[PDB]
Amino acid sequence: PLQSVQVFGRKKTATAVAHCKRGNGLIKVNGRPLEMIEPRTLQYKLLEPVLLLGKERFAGVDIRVRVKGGGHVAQIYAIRQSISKALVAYYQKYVDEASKKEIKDILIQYDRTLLVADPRRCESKKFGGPGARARYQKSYR
Amino acid sequence: VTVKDVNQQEFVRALAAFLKKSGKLKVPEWVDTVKLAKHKELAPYDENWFYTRAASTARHLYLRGGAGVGSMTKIYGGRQRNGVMPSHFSRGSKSVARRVLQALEGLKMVEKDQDGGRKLTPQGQRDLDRIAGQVAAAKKK
Amino acid sequence: RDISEASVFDAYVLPKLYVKLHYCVSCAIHSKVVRNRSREARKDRTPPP
Amino acid sequence: PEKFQHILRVLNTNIDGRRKIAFAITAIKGVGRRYAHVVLRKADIDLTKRAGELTEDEVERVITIMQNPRQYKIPDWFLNRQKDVKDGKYSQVLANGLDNKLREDLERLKKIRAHRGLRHFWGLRVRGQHTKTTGRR
Amino acid sequence: TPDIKLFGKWSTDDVQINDISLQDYIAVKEKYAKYLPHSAGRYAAKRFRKAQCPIVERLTNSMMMHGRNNGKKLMTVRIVKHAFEIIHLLTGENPLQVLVNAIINSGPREDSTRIGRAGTVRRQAVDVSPLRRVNQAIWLLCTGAREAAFRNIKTIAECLADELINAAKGSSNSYAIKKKDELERVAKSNR
Amino acid sequence: RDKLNNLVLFDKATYDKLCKEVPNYKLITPAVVSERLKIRGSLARAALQELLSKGLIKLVSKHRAQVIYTRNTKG
Amino acid sequence: PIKLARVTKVIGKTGSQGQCTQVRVEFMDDTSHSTIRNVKGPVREGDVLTLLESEREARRL
RNA sequence: AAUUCCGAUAACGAACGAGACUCUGGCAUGCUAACUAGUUACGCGACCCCCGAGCGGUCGGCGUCCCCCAACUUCUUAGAGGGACAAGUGGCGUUCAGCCACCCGAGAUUGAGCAAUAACAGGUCUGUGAUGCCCUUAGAUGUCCGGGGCUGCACGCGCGCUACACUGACUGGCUCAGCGUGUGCCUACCCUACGCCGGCAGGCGCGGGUAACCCGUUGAACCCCAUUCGUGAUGGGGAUCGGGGAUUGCAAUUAUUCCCCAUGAACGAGGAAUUCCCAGUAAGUGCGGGUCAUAAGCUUGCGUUGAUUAAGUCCCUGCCCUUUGUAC
RNA sequence: UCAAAGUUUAAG
């Protein structure tokens, strides 16, 4: 019997699903490790959970992630949420709950985004203007 | 180690050098004179560009197969300054993509697949994934 | 309290400045000594609290 | 490196040696960033150089290519005058010669009393753009 | 990295705030100073939520300005990092501390609120809020750095460094510090 | 007021100034070299690459828009 | 003398256009002292103002 | 937020509007679901070549070859349920209506749609085989055909796009979307994969698609990463104009559009004025839909990147109630 | 604890 956990992260329209498995802790996105992805200025983001919790917590859990939708930044924020969420879901099911709780606490005090997904989503444009809230310029005279 | 394990930028540099050293591609007559797409104000500053984009096509083919000429134009697309009007998409040059794909065909990097469009072949998988390994074993950086 | 603090005399009760003012209607109304009233509330000649 | 010209005199024009070569040539009437780059590639010059470098032989070599493009495989398109009425030639007109060719064409339309020449004569827009709202000079 | 959080390279600890007022509303450290100055950060939700956004993030945000740079954060993240690098080479010490000092001597102390006053506009002096002082400081010196970097060969990062240095030093030489003393002088002239 | 005219050359005195002085600065950027001297900008970049290759100035970062260089690395 | 002053009670928002919070302040050094004053910017109970003047005390404006 | 409530009371008991309501947004490892979703992780049954690590095993990576007698619904589509109520804790409030904070967690507030009475002599007879009267009615104001015009330029104003650069430009490279739409038609034709020919616009072949099937992992832009350029009206800007080449069309000259070479204007951030906007908003950034043979500097949608500042006030401009004065 | 602010087809 194998220890499989498939957990998702979201940001606007970026469904990043991280999939944890009893392994040796590779952690690769689509088909490549966390040292590319390639917005790159936001590398420490997709690293953050690993940096917070350390390699010791991950150690025995290999995580293959798949992403689609969103744009570059949104995808990073999705995977970052997802791999952390997946790790928490692994520890819930196939370790012990006090350990999970400790991980969850360590993540949240850094940032609540790591588990909780933003509801914020693109607002709809309405006629009489180029965007949602902005209007087209008034002539008057 | 595969090609996805390598930072794709410094990969295509190494593949281009590989394709120069081989010296059996089939760079056509134009190269010097041509624009490269209706996008562009200018032609490429790197005077042996054909080798570079040939490499880029090959690596694209490894990552995603079944890529026809039209598909190769779409990937090499961008902004088109209408100048005083606003910008739009424009597909890259067909003929250059087609010449690149025919050049790779002669090398036996690639082969035209069933159900249309190019895919790279085992003998091509050789070179691509060999140079990946070379880049990985360049230095720890 | 500042003056109490720096007074020579102990405790000291302060003084008071008394003025009988004389507003004419115009000047009373403008300075909001007197507002208008409704036709029925005009007749309440008790002072306010 | 190279301490020589800096400033250049080519085909009646004063080319800035100070500038980089592909963009330095374009100072001449009739050669644009396309054609200059093409011309330089047919010359086989290290175009990273400034125009203030380069041997006098090299600049003469460039000039000969620029003048006579089709003898060194500068193709048909890259030619500002293709199929040019006064003889059925196809070539790239440069310097004062370009401006002279233009004036002859305007003069030709004028002599014909065509529409396009008349508007040219009247100092109006020729390429049927709306003139109610723009170009108030 | 696990026990203490660097800012890529730089330290959060050993960054002492001088003025008890800028303190609290400068989030260089509560304890919480993250790796990057990019963040999801819905700090515009409520009124004072803004204050608990980190000052290096806030500086990035302010940098992302004047039409063509609107929304381009990563662009400006890089700018910030380079300015911090440049501050480290030029001045020494932690660039975050330099930035903090600059903020402290760049925000006003009192401004002149435009009251009506009959009809023709003559103002009275009033004493600015610490958050408002932090806000002004940030945008003043960011703007001063921006205005410097247009039509001469100098990167934004370099300018941004030079402004922060000449703010941290009471130089009367940065835009921001000079602008602040001009506001203060106006305030005194109607206090 | 501003009308800034720069050099594009190996013109002896400036090249000596580069070899002596530039390696003692803390900030060494193409921009900072151009404002110190009256050197183009491209010329400044090339000059800073030569000093890197020689081993007189130290690399900090080599990013698209801005490169940064340091003093020798003294002791 | 640049005196600091902690806010005890944010009173009410004055100013013509609505801007200057009228604020009641403890005077930090000797907490017996307690003035009122107007402030540009967003203020809240439990923060510190930097008052350059220390003797003016605004009321209605 | 509200003529929303509480409460007062020559009023009583009602009606509309507001609210409720409908759609949408976001929470559901809960349930029902699948070859026109994924497959999902397996099994790797493999193919497969050294594909790589590696002496070789075992692993890493995809492309896929996969059906069905593998296993399911995490992602997917969309059903019907649930889900937040101001319900909890603390204040404040006549300890009412309610307001403030904080816990749990979306915190009453996601954004639209619908929308009263009474008006206006608002617009529309050029949307109607809705229509009164008036006019005209064969040398027609009917109707159709050819041509022209609605595009004409001393000038004045309105919504727009492009810019004035180096937080940039160019040249490469890398790499992520979401609403849609689509032929085989109401009168003649769609979306288009793949292969060759053409620098390019484009041309010629064959295919798929009445569509979660094919286009289509819609491989978008900005962004990101290496380029050179160096504050010079410069490689910024791309107007004007000369020459050529394509397609649409019955026909394109007064340039239909598109491509190419050449030309290279003002513009170095805009006086007095004044517009719009508070959260995934503004702004940037592209792509759909509309019109459409040809086709957007408009529009109406869509996402992608993502600020500053507010959280208030009646100063201006207006609006709502109350009292008031009024020769309107 | 009071700056300036004048006028409005004949054409129904």
UniProtKB/Swiss-Prot annotation, chain B:
Keyword tags: Acetylation, Cytoplasm, Host-virus interaction, Methylation, Nucleus, Ribonucleoprotein, Ribosomal protein
Superkingdom of the organism of origin: Eukaryota
Record Gene3D superfamilies: Winged helix-like DNA-binding domain superfamily/Winged helix DNA-binding domain
GO BP, sorted A to Z: ribosomal small subunit assembly; translation
Gene Ontology MF, one: structural constituent of ribosome
One Pfam family here: Ribosomal_S19e
Positions bearing N6-succinyllysine: 140
Gene Ontology CC: cytosolic ribosome; cytosolic small ribosomal subunit; nucleolus
Residues with PTM N6-acetyllysine: 20, 108, 112
Omega-N-methylarginine carried by residues: 64
Coiled coil: none
Location within or outside the cell: Cytoplasm; Nucleus, Nucleolus
The family this protein is said to belong to: Belongs to the eukaryotic ribosomal protein eS19 family.
Subunit field text: Component of the small ribosomal subunit. Part of the small subunit (SSU) processome, composed of more than 70 proteins and the RNA chaperone small nucleolar RNA (snoRNA) U3. Interacts with RPS19BP1; the interaction is direct and mediates the integration of RPS19 in state post-A1. Interacts with RPS19BP1.
Known function: Component of the small ribosomal subunit. The ribosome is a large ribonucleoprotein complex responsible for the synthesis of proteins in the cell. Required for pre-rRNA processing and maturation of 40S ribosomal subunits. Part of the small subunit (SSU) processome, first precursor of the small eukaryotic ribosomal subunit.
Protein name: Small ribosomal subunit protein eS19
Gene name, Swiss-Prot/TrEMBL: RPS19
Curated annotation (Swiss-Prot), chain D:
GO MF annotation terms: rRNA binding; structural constituent of ribosome
Position of the Glycyl lysine isopeptide (Lys-Gly) (interchain with G-Cter in SUMO2) cross-link: 86, 89, 101
Entry keyword set: Acetylation, Cytoplasm, Isopeptide bond, Ribonucleoprotein, Ribosomal protein, RNA-binding, rRNA-binding, Ubl conjugation
Localization, UniProt: Cytoplasm
InterPro entries found in the cross-reference section: Rbsml_uS13_C, Ribosomal_uS13, Ribosomal_uS13-like_H2TH, Ribosomal_uS13_CS
SUPFAM superfamilies: S13-like H2TH domain
Pfam families, per the entry: Ribosomal_S13
UniProt entry tagged with the keyword Cytoplasm: yes
GO-annotated biological processes: translation
Gene3D superfamilies associated with the record: 1.10.8.50, 30s ribosomal protein s13, domain 2
Record-level GO cellular component terms: cytosolic ribosome; small ribosomal subunit
Modified residues (N6-acetyllysine): 89, 101
Summary of the function given for this chain in its UniProt record: Component of the small ribosomal subunit. The ribosome is a large ribonucleoprotein complex responsible for the synthesis of proteins in the cell.
Subunit organization: Component of the small ribosomal subunit.
PANTHER family tied to this protein: 30S RIBOSOMAL PROTEIN S13/40S RIBOSOMAL PROTEIN S18, SMALL RIBOSOMAL SUBUNIT PROTEIN US13
Similarity annotation: Belongs to the universal ribosomal protein uS13 family.
Protein name: Small ribosomal subunit protein uS13
Native source species: Oryctolagus cuniculus
Swiss-Prot record, chain F:
UniProt GO MF annotations: structural constituent of ribosome
Cellular component terms (Gene Ontology): cytosolic ribosome; cytosolic small ribosomal subunit; nucleolus; postsynaptic density
Keywords on record: Acetylation, Cytoplasm, Ribonucleoprotein, Ribosomal protein
Modified residues (N6-acetyllysine): 3, 12, 20, 26, 54
Signal peptide: none
Main location: cytoplasm
Protein name: Small ribosomal subunit protein eS25
Taxonomic source organism: Oryctolagus cuniculus (Rabbit)
From Swiss-Prot, chain G:
Sites of Phosphoserine modification: 34
One Gene Ontology term from the biological process aspect of the record: ribosomal small subunit assembly
Main subcellular location: cytoplasm
SUPFAM superfamilies referenced in this protein's UniProt entry, alphabetically: Nucleic acid-binding proteins (SSF50249)
Domain of life: Eukaryota
Location(s) in or outside the cell: Cytoplasm, Cytosol; Cytoplasm; Rough endoplasmic reticulum; Nucleus, Nucleolus
Similarity-based family: Belongs to the eukaryotic ribosomal protein eS28 family.
Listed name of the protein: Small ribosomal subunit protein eS28
Species the sequence originates in: Oryctolagus cuniculus (Rabbit)
